[PDB]
Amino acid sequence: LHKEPATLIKAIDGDTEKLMYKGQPMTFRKLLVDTPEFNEKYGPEASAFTKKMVENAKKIEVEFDKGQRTDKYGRGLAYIYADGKMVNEALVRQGLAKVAYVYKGNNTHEQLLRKAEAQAKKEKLNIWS
Numbered sequence: 540l541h542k543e544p545a546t547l548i549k550a551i552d553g554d555t556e557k558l559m560y561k562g563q564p565m566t567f568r569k570l571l572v573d574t575p576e577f578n579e580k581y582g583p584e585a586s587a588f589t590k591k592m593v594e595n596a597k598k599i600e601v602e603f604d605k606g607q608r609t610d611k612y613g614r615g616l617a618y619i620y621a622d623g624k625m626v627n628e629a630l631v632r633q634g635l636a637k638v639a640y641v642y643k644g645n646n647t648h649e650q651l652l653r654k655a656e657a658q659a660k661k662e663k664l665n666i667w668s
């Protein structure tokens with residue numbers, strides 16, 4: 540897989556940012572994860588964690604997997620990196636998302652995120668508390 544450039548247009552919630560990619564505005568949805576929505580428990584904390592991570596980053600990058608690159612809503616599907624740190628992975632690691640929506644051929648980082656969730660679950664972090 541390879542990292543490609545984008546710039547933050549706006550942090551939306553745990554699951555999504557609007558990013559500019561190849562010069563065009565797009566909503567991106569994070570592969571392999573599910574954060575609580577805003578009114579659910581840890582929903583606000585997930586959005587704050589993502590917002591801070593992507594807003595403080597000097598460099599935002601997107602990384603597509605082998606399969607579908609846009610979902611049925613036209614959202615880009617990618618792993619998102621903030622100064623080289625994967626945001627998808629860091630949400631799970633922190634107990635602010637679960638590994639979810641693991642589809643065949645779009646799941647290269649499945650095992651890496653499942654390990655992160657195991658540790659968050661072991662530390663009883665947030666969602667796992």
Ligand SMILES: Cc1cn([C@H]2C[C@H](OP(=O)(O)O)[C@@H](COP(=O)(O)O)O2)c(=O)[nH]c1=O
Pocket residue numbers: 554568569570571572573610611616640642645
């Ligand atoms: C993460 C992800 C979601 N989706 C679709 C499936 C779900 O459909 P439905 O809207 O029909 O449930 C929806 C979940 O996204 P959200 O968790 O952002 O709602 O997005 C994909 O098709 N591919 C993906 O990789």
Ligand SMILES: [Ca+2]
Pocket residue numbers: 554573574575576
């Ligand atoms: Ca969600």
